[PDB]
Amino acid sequence: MKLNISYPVNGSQKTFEIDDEHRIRVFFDKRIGQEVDGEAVGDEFKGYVFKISGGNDKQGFPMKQGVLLPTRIKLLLT
């Protein structure tokens, strides 16, 4: 997976291509807004907390905050 990370008050943002998906599996089945630890995604970034803010999947499709159903669905938007 790739992880986009943003430190907002300093104004910094960078992506990190993290393979080895048992590091990734901390985020699994956690919807948007619920926080996370650095401890189970990495070891070299411990004491870290990330509020997730969506993400495009493969096939590029975005997620909007808080509906349900982590597959794709066909809604009515602007």
Binding site: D29, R31, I32, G33, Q65, G66, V67, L68, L69, P70, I73, K74, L75, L76
Partner: protein
């Protein structure tokens, strides 16, 4: 984690309430669940999706796909509705406040027919296919979907009927009249079998029975009133009953069983403001579902512990009980958020 109202040692949740950081942690389940300031009647189809919610101003049909979590369409029907049923999937029959009957299809509006007097309720018969429609007066009509005829309408008492239902495993036609008599007809014989009378101990004014129901054992019958008093009935000593006064008691409109999920012998009663749920053979309240606005009616989704109301506000409330059962396969992360 959605907040829970206080109850008798049990938890319920609402999704799409009048109150429902919150913008960025939104818990919206079904997108575009809001009507034009009220709601008529909501019911969920026999299969695992496709719930239908009737409209309020410029009344619509509003079929929601459960496996898409949003709206499919809204056929703005010609008149304001009171009662309808669903006949599997795409077909459905409706009747409006005027004495007219619409047949919606996949294309929508397959026919518009009428009944001679103003109607109040409709049910469909799975066996030999005649919809029975209860109306004002001496008249309980049929529209058979076999050959499209009319049938020899059932001769009632003076004022009429508020609700008609047929029993499922054996077919015993109920008709909740005004003069406390329940007027059981036989869907085989096209004749009466019984004229059971309803009694109480308070007797405020001459109440009228407004809700009738059965279940899939075919032996009991749930009865209502225009006063907020549930009743049970059996053939076993059919003259008395067990009764349930409700703490506000205006008019109970929806009494439905829990005869297909676990935590058995339980039944939901629903009058204009509150909807409660209690147990059989004692008559003690399991839980209740107090919203912030009145209730036009309710419904309960099969297989799981969730409820869908039609109310007088802009959205509709859904009520999840994590002790009656789980959340269904299309809502299978409601048990992960709350």
């Amino acid at each position: 984690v959605l907040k829970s109202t206080s109850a008798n040692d049990v938890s319920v949740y609402q999704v799409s309430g009048t109150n429902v950081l919150e913008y960025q942690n939104r818990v919206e389940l079904i997108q575009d669940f809001e009507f034009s300031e009220a709601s008529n009647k909501i019911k969920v189809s026999r299969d695992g999706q496709y719930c239908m919610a009737t409209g309020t101003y410029k009344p619509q049909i509003h079929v929601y796909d459960f496996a898409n979590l949003s709206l499919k369409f809204d056929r703005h029907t010609d008149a304001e509705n009171v009662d309808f049923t669903i006949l599997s999937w795409t077909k459905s029959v409706h009747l409006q406040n005027d004495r007219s009957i619409q047949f919606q299809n996949k294309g929508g509006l397959h026919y518009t027919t009428r009944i001679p007097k103003f109607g109040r309720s409709l049910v469909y018969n799975k066996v030999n296919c005649d919809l029975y429609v209860g109306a004002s007066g001496n008249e309980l009509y049929r529209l058979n979907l076999e050959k499209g005829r009319f049938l020899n309408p059932f001769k009632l008492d003076t004022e009429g009927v508020n609700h008609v239902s047929i029993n499922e495993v054996n077919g015993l036609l109920a008709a909740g009249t005004e003069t406390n008599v329940v007027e059981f007809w036989d869907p085989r014989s096209r004749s009466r079998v019984s004229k059971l009378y309803l009694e109480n101990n308070i007797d405020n004014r001459p109440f009228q029975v407004t809700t009738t129901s059965f279940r899939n054992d075919g032996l009991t019958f749930a009865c209502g009133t225009s006063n907020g008093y549930s009743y049970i009935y059996d053939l076993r000593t059919s003259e008395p009953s067990i009764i349930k006064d409700q703490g506000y008691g205006f008019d109970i409109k929806k009494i439905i069983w829990l005869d297909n999920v676990g935590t058995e012998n339980k039944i939901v009663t629903c009058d204009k403001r509150i909807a409660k749920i209690w147990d059989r053979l004692d008559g003690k309240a399991y839980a209740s579902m107090e919203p912030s606005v009145d209730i036009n009616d309710i419904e309960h989704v099969p297989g799981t512990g969730m409820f869908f109301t039609a109310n007088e506000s802009i959205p509709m409330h859904t009520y999840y009980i994590p002790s009656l059962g789980p959340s269904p396969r299309w809502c299978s992360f409601l048990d992960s958020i709350t």
